[PDB]
Amino acid sequence: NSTITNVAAFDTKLNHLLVDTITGRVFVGGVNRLYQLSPDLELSETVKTGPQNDSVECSILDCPLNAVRSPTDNYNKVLLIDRATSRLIACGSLFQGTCTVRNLQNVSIIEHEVPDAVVANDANSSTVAFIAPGPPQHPVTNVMYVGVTYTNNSPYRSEIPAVASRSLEKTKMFQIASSAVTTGTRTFINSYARETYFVNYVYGFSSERFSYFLTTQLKHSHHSSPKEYITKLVRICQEDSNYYSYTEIPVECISDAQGGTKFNLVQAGFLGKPSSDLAQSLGISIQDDVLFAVFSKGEGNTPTNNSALCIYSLKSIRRKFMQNIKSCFNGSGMRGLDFISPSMPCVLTKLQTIGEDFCGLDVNSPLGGETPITSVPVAMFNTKLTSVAATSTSGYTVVFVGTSDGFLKKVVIESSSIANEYASFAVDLGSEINRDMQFDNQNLYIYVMSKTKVSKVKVFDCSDYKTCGDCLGARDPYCGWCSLENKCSPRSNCQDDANDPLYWVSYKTGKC
Amino acid sequence: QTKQDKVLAHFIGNSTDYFKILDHNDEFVLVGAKDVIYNVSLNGLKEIARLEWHSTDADRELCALKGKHEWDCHNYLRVYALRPNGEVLLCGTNSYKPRCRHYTPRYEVSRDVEAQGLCPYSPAHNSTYAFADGHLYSATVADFSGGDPLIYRENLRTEQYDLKQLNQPDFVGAIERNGYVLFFFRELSMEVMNFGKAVYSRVARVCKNDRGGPYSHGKSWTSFLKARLNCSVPGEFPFYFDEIQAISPIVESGSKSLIYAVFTTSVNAIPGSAVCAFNVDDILAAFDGEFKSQKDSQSHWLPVEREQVPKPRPGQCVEDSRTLTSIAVNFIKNHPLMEEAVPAVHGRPLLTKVNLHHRLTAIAVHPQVKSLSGAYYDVIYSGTDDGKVTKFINILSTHPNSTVDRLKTVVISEMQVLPLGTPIRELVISTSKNSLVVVSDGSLVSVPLHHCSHIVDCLGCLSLQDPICAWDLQTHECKNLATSQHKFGTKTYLQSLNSTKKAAALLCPH
Ligand SMILES: *[C@@H]1O[C@H](CO)[C@@H](O[C@@H]2O[C@H](CO)[C@@H](O[C@@H]3O[C@H](CO[C@H]4O[C@H](CO)[C@@H](O)[C@H](O)[C@@H]4O)[C@@H](O)[C@H](O[C@H]4O[C@H](CO)[C@@H](O)[C@H](O)[C@@H]4O)[C@@H]3O)[C@H](O)[C@H]2NC(C)=O)[C@H](O)[C@H]1NC(C)=O
Ligand SMILES: *[C@@H]1O[C@H](CO)[C@@H](O[C@@H]2O[C@H](CO)[C@@H](O[C@@H]3O[C@H](CO[C@H]4O[C@H](CO)[C@@H](O)[C@H](O)[C@@H]4O)[C@@H](O)[C@H](O[C@H]4O[C@H](CO)[C@@H](O)[C@H](O)[C@@H]4O)[C@@H]3O)[C@H](O)[C@H]2NC(C)=O)[C@H](O)[C@H]1NC(C)=O
Ligand SMILES: *[C@@H]1O[C@H](CO)[C@@H](O)[C@H](O)[C@H]1NC(C)=O
Ligand SMILES: *[C@@H]1O[C@H](CO)[C@@H](O)[C@H](O)[C@H]1NC(C)=O
Ligand SMILES: *[C@@H]1O[C@H](CO)[C@@H](O)[C@H](O)[C@H]1NC(C)=O
Ligand SMILES: *[C@@H]1O[C@H](CO)[C@@H](O)[C@H](O)[C@H]1NC(C)=O
């Protein structure tokens, strides 16, 4: 195939994938393995991370009686790059979720080994980690925001928070960033809900002085109601060194079809920028952020083959958080988040200037919003969608969507209402496409990772359209047709030397 | 309805402030109030010194901003302690932003710092503390919203939001004893598998040489244990008083150390009050029995299986608690409640007031008043929520009407001290000045501890049945036996306590 450029097949099962934004090097974290590659998927270094002797009942320092360490696999759970200090962060499942700090030029080198329990020690329990501004100092130092699911397999697991900010200082590596006697940059799930109410962390991102987590979880903690799974959005102010601003609102992607259809289970997320046309529909500037996410209707907690693509602007996300916060501080309703501590009523407050930047106070502090942010999907699909990525190199936004069956689909989004597929092909047939799907630095190639392979896929190829009815017929937003030369190519490739403005024509603006 | 008492002195402030005895000697008492703290002489309830500390206008605008009222946004002084160097530790609520200061000598501010977990936010009588061996043990809330109760010392706290250790408690007192610190409070019941918003009263304990567990446990207690207090009426038809209201300091009644407590019934129940007393040895002995099992999905099991208790029993004070095992510290954090309930002295309440209009609210005891026969009786003072003080003793008549010993309550007097509606918050006894200081929200009133001098009639002196007043027959004066000297073989003095009150009067001739 000519659309796929490079293919790298690995020996183990792959877990994560990131691209260095300035050097374009590729880092792949997998089961018992850890690989570094060049921008063309040429292997540079490979690191054996397992297996090692380990039991879930034991920590590194002590192993209780009648328990024995046995060789177990080391699933990679976190893969991150620090920009200020050139060093790679990789966390494994062994030893209660340990992180190592490796050199960026050569991942084989270990620079710092920490013993702190940071990440889920399960093979399937989620873990989401991104680096963004935070305390202790005012936002000149970055921290690691981590969200971990309670694996429920060890007594040492209670020690690990569910959401927390963690320091990147050499002296205090991976410790909670700011902690005091009664408060800190940390949220635990209470002893009564910890073993029953689990939280699945899907995606994490930072936008406009706030840290975000996209989660799936049970709507209710008490057993008074039947089990319903919802998608939530966890937020914290980055200046906040107390998590006074820990707040959640639910996320609904609702459809007209079959009466009421709720795509309750989110599968993957991607934060990106809109196009000229799309920014007008959402009522935002082109420099503003848009959240792209793929939701799947789920039988219980299991996603079905009935997915949908939903977009959310962060102006409406911030205005929905503000809507839930304003309402609590006006005394209406219950604070929520009964699975942190018993839910007490919202207090009436004299607060007069709660805005989009509200950063939290002592009162109504851990707030659980009930008013959801709602969106109607621009596209629906007959397969389970497992990844999402968005680029606006062309004048239009194109969303790249990965299939659990191994297919890549491209959707062009012209409005909050109108969008449709213009391409669809298999990258690794029979192999679910991983959630970590990232572009090249120029957004010209996209890295698609399946179970055991990584494929460098070209974002557009207009040269393979010989005749012109094929160029405009492909309905590719990247492809137009120069009148003079017989080449299909984008606008920049044609020469406006021709007198007629119909030198370059799009697939919907004219006829060839 | 009720005779008013002979008020000796008074010390009045507004009703808006909220007095809290923060230290008491027989000569002086310290009173924390709305924006000041008073040093008051017990000689005439006269102010001797004052230390004013007002919340800044910005700090108290923040309080009203977060949904509070004017009367809540003040700096209610609520913690006092004289440090071993002459320094003065003084903390206040500071409009729901508690602060602590270090005054050094008059006084001058030497340190100011946050006090979350060291000092309540609200002026309510919800909290307590004990400055034991140069360290403040605090039992309060650490959050503005009041949903994070804890027991905090320097670098050690209970588990945040752990309801098996503390479930919405109201602390009533704290005692230092024998290398432990005891905390008295009422709590929500999650102990029983079928709990339904019931309130039970606990006594808790922490070792003073606790230094936290190993590794991550280094900031939490390795010795926190609690037991239920049993203040019930026994028999075929039990009657429980489950909400503890006030305790007393440890009282040395002969060879027994006792703690006296006031209990009441829950709301939407048969209204009633009681006074109970618990031996200090019975309190500590309960922490040596079985632990109560945690809640599971089956909920059909005995207390903790005794095969799960580690070889060094949890709760004992080890020299370095940082050497314990993760198994041991996690155990005591999952089994902080003892199985056995602390029994009461005589196995029943010493006084009961059921279905009356008023409730008992405070307690104080004058121990070991030697009667005319040479018997020692503790004299018990209990104040009501409508401003009365009840005085009484207990006599354990051996086989008076049955083979089982029968305990009887001898009520000496129940007089009105404060105006008809005002709740008595605390009581402080000065055995030296023969004065009883009654504490309300905005006043202190002193009354006579013993009324021997006031009465002049023979019938009154014997009907009073005070163990310290007896009628002389050479002198017509009803005399105080503390200053008098009987000789066991003289028919001079006359006193009747075991009989009825009318029977005591018949002993008076003519
Ligand atoms: C409420 O207000 C009352 C009255 O203002 C305070 O009571 C006074 O408290 C001060 C401070 O403790 C007392 O001063 C101390 O007196 C001690 C005893 O003094 C008597 O005995 C000596 C001989 O032993 C006589 O010379 C003297 O005239 C008295 O008859 C002294 O021993 C103390 O000195 C020691 O301590 C200081 C401080 O560390 C050291 O610097 C000295 O070097 C020395 O070691 C001290 O002088 C005063 O006597 C009290 N007055 C009364 C009438 O009781 C209360 O303290 C206050 N409430 C609270 C809670 O403080
Ligand atoms: C607060 O404090 C009060 C008083 O201190 C407690 O009341 C006691 O409660 C216990 C149990 O709740 C009572 O003890 C029970 O006695 C029952 C019958 O006793 C009669 O029969 C025995 C037979 O030898 C006689 O000796 C005795 O004198 C009585 O005539 C028993 O049926 C109870 O069950 C246990 O023993 C039997 C027999 O061995 C077993 O079959 C059972 O399975 C079980 O093991 C128990 O022995 C006691 O009598 C009460 N005392 C009083 C004065 O009322 C409260 O319980 C306490 N509250 C709390 C919360 O702690
Ligand atoms: C622990 O590792 C050793 C290798 O040093 C291995 O031989 C042994 O089998 C492991 N333990 C168990 C219980 O398998
Ligand atoms: C990278 O690190 C490994 C292990 O220390 C070493 O063998 C190798 O020589 C280093 N450099 C390169 C270019 O591989
Ligand atoms: C983890 O997930 C994989 C794929 O869904 C599955 O094959 C495996 O059995 C799971 N492991 C556990 C312990 O559930
Ligand atoms: C969903 O589609 C994928 C194709 O990638 C397939 O593996 C899976 O079996 C399908 N499930 C159902 C229920 O159709």
Numbering used by the authors:
A (entry chain A): 62 to 573
B (entry chain B): 43 to 147, 165 to 569
Q: What do the study authors state?
A:
Semaphorin ligands interact with plexin receptors to contribute to functions in the development of myriad tissues including neurite guidance and synaptic organisation within the nervous system. Cell‐attached semaphorins interact in trans with plexins on opposing cells, but also in cis on the same cell. We have discovered a distinct mode of interaction through which the Drosophila semaphorin Sema1b and mouse Sema6A mediate binding in cis to their cognate plexin receptors. Sema1a and Sema1b are most closely related to the mammalian class 6 semaphorins and interact with the sole Drosophila class A plexin, PlexA.
We next determined crystal structures of the PlexA1‐4‐Sema1b1‐2 complex from two different crystal forms (1:1 complex and 2:2 complex) at 3.0 and 4.8 Å resolution. The 1:1 complex crystal lattice contains one PlexA1‐4 monomer and one Sema1b1‐2 monomer per asymmetric unit. The crystal packing provides no Sema1b1‐2 dimerisation resembling that of the generic homodimeric architecture. The Sema1b1‐2 bound in the 1:1 complex with PlexA1‐4 is very similar to the unbound Sema1b1‐2 with the Cα rmsd of 0.81 Å indicating no large conformational changes upon complex formation. Only small differences in loop orientations at the ligand–receptor interface are apparent. The PlexA1‐4 structure in the 1:1 complex contains a sema domain composed of a seven‐bladed β‐propeller fold, which is followed by a PSI domain; however, we were not able to locate the IPT1‐PSI2 domain segment. The sema domain of PlexA is most similar to mouse PlxnA2 with an rmsd of 1.43 Å over 424 matched Cα positions. In the 1:1 complex crystal structure, PlexA1‐4 and Sema1b1‐2 interact through their sema domains in a head‐to‐head orientation similar to the generic architecture shared by all reported structures of semaphorin–plexin complexes (Janssen et al, 2010; Liu et al, 2010; Nogi et al, 2010). The PlexA1‐4‐Sema1b1‐2 interface buries a total solvent‐accessible area of 1,837 Å2. This extensive interface is composed of a mixture of hydrophobic and hydrophilic interactions similar to that of PlxnA2‐Sema6A.
